[PDB]
Homo-oligomer: A and B are copies of this chain.
Amino acid sequence: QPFAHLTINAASIPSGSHKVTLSSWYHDRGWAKISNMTLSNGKLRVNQDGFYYLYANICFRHHETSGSVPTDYLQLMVYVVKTSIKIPSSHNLMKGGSTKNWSGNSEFHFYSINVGGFFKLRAGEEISIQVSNPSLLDPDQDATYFGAFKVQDID
């Protein structure tokens, strides 16, 4: 059946704090795997109609070593958006995150966000991840990832 568990590809990540779309994932190394669905530039396309469970885990971390956060109070957000090739429309399925104060002398800072839900998806619909502060992302495969798996055929 259709499913996917993609892990962050640190090698490519735009610096900044702007809400961006992460488009570098692995589908073969470690826990990364993908059956049926295809991965097109960080976009997880659906090739089979059905009701899937979509989930994402995003880890953020700051180490004084890397320098200092670009702002005392910052927004650590994750957005699970859905697009389509058949239609240029865009939609948010899930949102999660929180504003966190990483100002000070605390040597280390960390914060993760989880999010999931049951959704109805049509072949052609694409799923992508949007986050803020992508420079603060934890690159480990067990820290940052998102995926999906079909539960039952569509009505």
User: Which residues of A does B touch, CB under 8 Å?
Assistant: 1, 3-5, 31, 33, 35, 51, 53, 55, 57, 59, 72-73, 75, 77, 79-80, 92-101, 106-120, 138, 140, 142-143, 145, 147-149, 151-152, 155
Interface of A is mostly: strand
Is there an interface contact between B145 and A117, defined as CB atoms closer than 8 Å? yes
Can you give 17 A-B contacts (C-beta < 8 A)? A1-B152, A4-B118, A31-B117, A31-B119, A31-B120, A57-B115, A57-B116, A73-B108, A92-B140, A99-B106, A101-B106, A112-B115, A114-B116, A116-B116, A117-B145, A117-B147, A149-B151
Contact for A108 among B57, B75, B114, CB less than 8 A: B75
